[PDB]
């Protein structure tokens, strides 16, 4: 949403309610990756006992750290684009 309200961002996509269309597409690329991740290797709770001989901790195995990084990485690619256009103006 912040990106759609920047000085030189909306004009390029137009002539290719459009603001809403672009808020929709990026959110849809985020929705799809999470669904694919859940269907293949869902993160779940794990009991760890090798760390301590007296107490046990309950963690959340996150599945491949490749997926968690890809969420943050996609989020950054968007923030960097927004930051670049705002800096040029």
């Amino acid at each position: 949403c912040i990106l759609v309200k920047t000085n030189r961002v909306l004009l390029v996509f137009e002539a290719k309610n459009l603001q809403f269309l672009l808020v929709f597409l990026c959110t849809f690329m985020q929705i799809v990756i999470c669904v694919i991740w859940l269907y293949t290797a869902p993160p779940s709770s794990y009991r760890n006992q090798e760390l301590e001989d007296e107490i046990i901790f309950i963690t959340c195995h996150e599945g491949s750290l490749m997926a968690l990084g890809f969420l943050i990485g996609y989020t950054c690619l968007l923030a960097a684009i927004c930051f670049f256009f705002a800096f040029k103006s």
Binding site: D53, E54, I55, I56, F57, I58
Partner: protein, 101 residues
């Protein structure tokens, strides 16, 4: 020989009959709850022996929770952020007809 007490274990004296022995303490991951025990029993999978190796006591579960000094602090911040966002939204709504909005 004097009898071995609970939490101890029998030991061999070389060259002597089995009636005569010595008492040795059990290790940390085991316990003994009888008298004149030839071995120390092992605690179950989710149990750990107490200081005096006579019984098994349940382990303590450690996790991040609401009633912890670290937890109470983080929540307050989230509620404060929610309240601030609600206040901003209520201001744009009530002042819907100003030129700025």
């Amino acid at each position: 020989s004097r009898d071995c007490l609970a939490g101890t274990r029998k030991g061999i004296i070389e060259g002597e009959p089995t009636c005569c022995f010595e008492c040795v303490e059990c290790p940390d991951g085991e316990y003994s709850d009888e008298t004149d025990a030839s071995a120390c029993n092992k605690c179950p999978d989710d149990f750990w022996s107490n200081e005096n190796h006579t019984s098994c006591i349940a382990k303590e579960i450690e996790f991040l929770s609401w009633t912890e000094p670290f937890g109470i602090a983080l929540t307050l911040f989230a509620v404060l952020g929610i309240f601030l966002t609600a206040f901003v939204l209520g201001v744009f709504i009530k002042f819907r007809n100003t030129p700025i909005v």
